[PDB]
Amino acid sequence: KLRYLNILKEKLGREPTFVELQAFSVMWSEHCGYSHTKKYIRRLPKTGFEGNAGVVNLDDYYSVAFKIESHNHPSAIEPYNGAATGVGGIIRDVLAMGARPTAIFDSLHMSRIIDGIIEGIADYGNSIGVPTVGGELRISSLYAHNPLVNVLAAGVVRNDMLVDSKASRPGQVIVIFGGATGRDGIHGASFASEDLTGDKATKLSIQVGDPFAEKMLIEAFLEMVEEGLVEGAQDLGAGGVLSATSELVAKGNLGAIVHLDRVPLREPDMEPWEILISESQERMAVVTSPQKASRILEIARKHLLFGDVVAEVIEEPVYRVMYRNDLVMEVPVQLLANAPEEDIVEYTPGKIPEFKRVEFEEVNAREVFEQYDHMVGTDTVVPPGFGAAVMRIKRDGGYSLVTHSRADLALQDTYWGTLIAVLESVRKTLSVGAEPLAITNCVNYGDPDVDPVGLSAMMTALKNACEFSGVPVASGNASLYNTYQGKPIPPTLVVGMLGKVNPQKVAKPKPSKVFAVGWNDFELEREKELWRAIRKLSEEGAFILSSSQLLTRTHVETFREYGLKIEVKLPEVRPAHQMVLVFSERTPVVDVPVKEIGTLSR
Ligand SMILES: Nc1ncnc2c1ncn2[C@@H]1O[C@H](COP(=O)(O)OP(=O)(O)CP(=O)(O)O)[C@@H](O)[C@H]1O
Ligand SMILES: O=CNCC(=O)N[C@@H]1O[C@H](COP(=O)(O)O)[C@@H](O)[C@H]1O
Ligand SMILES: [Mg+2]
Numbered sequence: 001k002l003r004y005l006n007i008l009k010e011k012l013g014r015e016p017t018f019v020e021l022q023a024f025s026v027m028w029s030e031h032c033g034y035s036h037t038k039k040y041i042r043r044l045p046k047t048g049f050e051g052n053a054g055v056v057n058l059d060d061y062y063s064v065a066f067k068i069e070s071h072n073h074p075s076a077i078e079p080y081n082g083a084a085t086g087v088g089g090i091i092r093d094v095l096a097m098g099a100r101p102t103a104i105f106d107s108l109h110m111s112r113i114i115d116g117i118i119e120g121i122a123d124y125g126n127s128i129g130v131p132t133v134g135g136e137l138r139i140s141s142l143y144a145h146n147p148l149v150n151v152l153a154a155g156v157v158r159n160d161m162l163v164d165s166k167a168s169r170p171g172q173v174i175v176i177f178g179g180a181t182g183r184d185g186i187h188g189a190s191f192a193s194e195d196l197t198g199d200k201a202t203k204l205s206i207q208v209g210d211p212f213a214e215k216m217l218i219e220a221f222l223e224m225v226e227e228g229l230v231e232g233a234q235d236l237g238a239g240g241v242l243s244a245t246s247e248l249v250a251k252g253n254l255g256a257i258v259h260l261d262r263v264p265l266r267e268p269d270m271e272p273w274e275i276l277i278s279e280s281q282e283r284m285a286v287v288t289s290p291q292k293a294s295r296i297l298e299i300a301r302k303h304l305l306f307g308d309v310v311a312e313v314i315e316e317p318v319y320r321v322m323y324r325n326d327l328v329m330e331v332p333v334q335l336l337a338n339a340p341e342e343d344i345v346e347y348t349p350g351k352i353p354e355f356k357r358v359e360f361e362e363v364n365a366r367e368v369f370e371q372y373d374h375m376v377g378t379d380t381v382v383p384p385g386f387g388a389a390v391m392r393i394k395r396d397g398g399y400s401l402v403t404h405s406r407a408d409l410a411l412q413d414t415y416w417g418t419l420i421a422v423l424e425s426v427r428k429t430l431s432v433g434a435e436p437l438a439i440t441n442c443v444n445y446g447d448p449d450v451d452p453v454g455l456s457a458m459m460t461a462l463k464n465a466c467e468f469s470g471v472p473v474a475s476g477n478a479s480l481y482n483t484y485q486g487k488p489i490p491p492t493l494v495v496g497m498l499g500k501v502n503p504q505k506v507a508k509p510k511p512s513k514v515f516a517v518g519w520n521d522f523e524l525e526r527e528k529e530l531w532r533a534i535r536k537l538s539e540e541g542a543f544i545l546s547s548s549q550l551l552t553r554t555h556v557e558t559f560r561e562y563g564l565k566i567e568v569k570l571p572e573v574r575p576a577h578q579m580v581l582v583f584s585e586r587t588p589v590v591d592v593p594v595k596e597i598g599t600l601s602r
């Protein structure tokens with residue numbers, strides 16, 4: 001913070017004005033600036049057009065846009081609105097790529113079942129009409145003060161309608177439609193960059209949220225894209241107008257002249273800076289030619305949304321904020337878009353540890369998911385209760401989504417627990433017949449300044465997991481400073497995996513013999529040997545289950561949907577094993593251990 005203020009003073013050549021301070025306090029905050037993770041993320045292998053979402057081609061005619069963000073700090077103080085809004089925001093990111101939001105996936109980490117979080121998410125995804133196709137839930141008293149709310153959203157988009165995430169030429173303009181701008185969330189980005197005992201941990205930093213407004217925003221935006229009116233786009237969230245406008249031009253290496261007075265207000269007494277950093281929801285920033293602005297405004301208004309032309313794209317690398325004919329601020333656009341970078345430390349792993357038992361409560365509760373009808377599997381090739389969620393796109397074309405993390409293992413060894421989480425995410429994808437395609441990930445950490453190693457260990461392990469597996473990183477998020485009066489959460493890296501699979505070849509449950517296939521302990525080397533065995537059996541028609549517990553209550557619940565009931569003598573397993581359960585007619589034949597342990601029937 002203060003180390004940064006000096007750097008700002010040196011660059012500015014003098015002391016910043018009130019608004020200059022407010023503005024950089026947002027853009028250079030860890031949440032928007034990424035000072036501590038910038039270099040690490042760069043060292044990661046990438047793929048797919050990365051524009052605040054990350055899209056991956058599936059069949060050349062269609063691509064899937066998937067991204068994972070989080071809303072941790074907000075949810076610790078206002079569970080209901082913090083979770084909902086989290087969904088609202090990640091949906092705007094996927095929509096901002098020209099994609100049609102088709103699936104939401106949740107990843108909760110709490111010390112008990114906080115109804116608010118569950119409902120906030122279910123209600124919001126419900127009012128906008130986008131289904132929940134899955135979502136891991138880990139309970140541990142270690143998240144008592146810092147619950148982690150990570151949400152993954154995937155949309156489908158035509159390869160020929162991909163929207164850019166930046167401005168591309170001087171003369172373009174920037175329209176901002178959606179809900180009206182109020183005073184909620186000001187500095188909520190600076191709030192998410194500190195310990196929960198900060199001076200900004202008040203309800204003022206929390207964003208509201210209106211799904212009916214968003215559903216409209218989804219319809220309007222897609223219409224704009226269908227008529228080729230969108231030349232570039234970015235959703236609004238942290239930083240509001242400031243963040244969005246400056247980032248669309250910094251990316252293109254252009255400039256902008258923002259006119260705050262043209263921004264639709266919901267509170268007319270607001271001041272220029274309040275209008276600039278307000279983090280109100282349901283708003284989208286579209287880049288286009290001056291001429292198309294007319295139809296875009298018409299489309300949003302008839303859709304019951306406000307908005308007007310707010311900025312002009314100029315070739316000069318300056319960010320000029322205007323309110324009428326009175327200048328508010330003015331600084332080098334590339335100054336804002338780039339926070340000071342912090343040095344990284346090199347991490348070198350040790351031997352895979354003898355992970356001991358550290359259980360995460362088995363509070364399986366579908367009761368709460370039914371009360372708030374948080375349906376998790378209405379329209380998938382095969383039910384999500386089993387793990388991977390498979391969606392169709394064509395009769396014989398589809399993709400899989402897997403969200404996994406092993407904070408339990410990582411808590412003991414940041415490196416190995418993380419690396420293992422990424423690898424296990426591959427077993428699941430393979431277990432359903434899908435071809436690992438890319439990864440979106442969310443890094444959930446505490447104080448980097450205090451414990452720099454642990455962060456380094458997460459990023460190195462994630463980097464090594466992609467090099468060892470060949471699976472690149474399409475996108476991600478990084479939530480740091482998840483601590484309460486000192487105490488930090490466990491290092492929790494949540495992995496979102498996307499895969500390619502023919503829905504006509506996805507196996508379903510049927511009366512059969514069950515087999516424990518693999519080893520009860522972990523060894524990196526032979527990991528690729530299990531992968532090869534899953535591909536073989538999966539290809540033969542076998543129904544495979546890849547859980548860290550082998551068999552869970554949900555699996556059995558889901559099994560009853562088929563009127564099937566399993567009787568198996570599960571093998572004793574270590575905290576990190578290399579085993580999966582195979583269901584087939586005959587005994588599997590593979591270059592890996594196989595043992596008949598039970599039966600599925602009726
Ligand atoms: N751990 C990670 N791995 C890979 N990419 C990551 C990453 N963390 C961040 N990114 C990439 O950096 C980009 C920026 O995330 P950032 O949180 O700063 O902005 P944003 O685009 O989400 C808008 P906002 O701040 O308004 O929410 C992401 O869109 C993603 O592609
Ligand atoms: O509406 C936009 N939501 C997008 C967004 O970027 N929101 C911002 O992130 C904070 C949570 O970050 P975390 O604690 O999870 O790291 C939240 O308080 C918002 O200011
Ligand atoms: Mg983010």
Ligand SMILES: [Mg+2]
Binds near residue numbers: 052
């Ligand atoms: Mg965003």
